[model samples]
Target: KPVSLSYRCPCRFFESHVARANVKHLKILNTPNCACQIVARLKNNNRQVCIDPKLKWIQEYLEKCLNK
Candidate 1:
């Protein structure tokens, strides 16, 4: 089964820099000002994974992460 969007991270750290979703104003972590990383919180297990936002396959994985 697929995870619902409600379990995804909806903070500015993931929205402004990563996937666009109807998230609340919750900042998961204190990201660096000049950082270029994306933090994804898995819905199934609730584990967090950090990756470079500029990665070649970021968009693809991000889509899966958000919808999974």
Candidate 2:
């Protein structure tokens, strides 16, 4: 089974995660299961970072990204 995970953009404005296997050419056909879980994208920036949504200190991480 593919365990579901959550991720957010650096600006904390966009959130997504991998919904299924073999997501070719970045063509997303299905809606994300949740706002916190799906393949997220950032504008003009290519680098991405994914973190466990269950983290208690997740806000701290988002804050750091927002400040940068």
Candidate 3:
């Protein structure tokens, strides 16, 4: 499976296993039955970082696509 959202950006946010699983599951739209299990102890510390400010365009696109 190809990694869609890479974790090696400036802030170095590591994607949890659950997040990775969600990526694959959501991308394929294969099985919603396999729920993503986020480990409680594995907290996210890094703030979202961008490779380029212009990348916010993708955020806009996503908001339009996914958000109401």
Candidate 4:
């Protein structure tokens, strides 16, 4: 199997960088090692974007987006 994307995680992003509407999906992944820790699928492209979670927006976003 081929890996879809690399795991060189980007540390942060915000409404300052992109709108909440631009994010189509997001998933959490973390480890003691260096990691992006979060996967954000942008609306414009299919690239697997790794970003750190924002305490304020990420939590709020997930609470509603996942609705689980």
Candidate 5:
């Protein structure tokens, strides 16, 4: 049987340069700089990137696009 792979990390924000996790089962990808770009970023990384809880724009966007 093929062994599955995974990684995990925790983040806090309004700060910068967080420590990334082991990145197993993950691909190296470029960072995005806008709310609009976040959806694709989340998709490619299996939805594992952590964003700041206070990022209201992200919450709003997700509520509209993903929740509805």
Candidate 6:
């Protein structure tokens, strides 16, 4: 199947995690069976970074974003 959405699934995971200061906002994707999970949109460059949900730190950071 072909898709046109710019937010396509990332086949490979990215390295490391994002800095709390640079993260403008966190958009939690409801991709239960998606190739990718939640992403962090940057504040400076506005770049979307991919991080592993399995990382316990990210779970904590996401809650922080929601609070702010």
Tell me the TM-score of model 6.
Answer: 0.52
As a whole number from 0 to 100, the lDDT of residue 57 in candidate 4 is: 61
1-68: candidate 2 lDDT, tens digit per residue: 44443532322433334322223212112324433522333334653433334333444545675695
Q: Which parts of model 1 have CA positions greater than 4 angstroms off?
A: 1-30, 59-68
TM-scores, all models, native as reference: 0.32, 0.26, 0.21, 0.49, 0.27, 0.52
Error of 4 at 29 (Å): 0.6
What is the C-alpha lDDT profile of model 5 across 1-68, one tens digit per residue?
44322321232223223222322222222233322212122334465454443345445645776668
Q: Candidate 3's error at 58, in angstroms?
A: 0.3
Ranking by lDDT: 6, 4, 1, 2, 5, 3
Model 3, span 1-68: residue lDDT tens: 34333322222322332322122112111123322221212225533321221234333534677775
Measured by TM-score, how close is model 5 to the native structure?
A: 0.27
lDDT of each candidate versus the true structure: 0.45, 0.36, 0.29, 0.57, 0.34, 0.61
Best model number under TM-score: 6
Candidate 4 Cα misplacement greater than 4 A, ranges: 1-16, 62-68
Q: Name the weakest run of 10 consecutive residues (lDDT summed) in model 6.
A: 27-36
Off by over 4 Å in 2: 1-31, 37-54
Pairs of residues at least 3 apart in sequence or in different chains that clash in candidate 5:
none
Model 1: lDDT equals 0.45
Q: How many backbone overlaps does candidate 2 show?
A: 4
Q: Tens digits of per-residue lDDT for model 4 on 1-68?
A: 44324533234342234445667877776544444356678886766665446645676866777775
User: What lDDT is reached at residue 68 by model 5?
Assistant: 82
* Prediction RMSDs, each to the true structure: 13.4, 12.5, 14.5, 5.6, 12.5, 5.0
- Which structure is stronger by TM-score: 1 or 2? 1
- Native-vs-model 6 lDDT? 0.61
- Considering lDDT, which of the candidate structures 1 and 4 is the better prediction for this target? 4
Question: What lDDT is obtained when candidate 3 is compared to the true structure?
Answer: 0.29
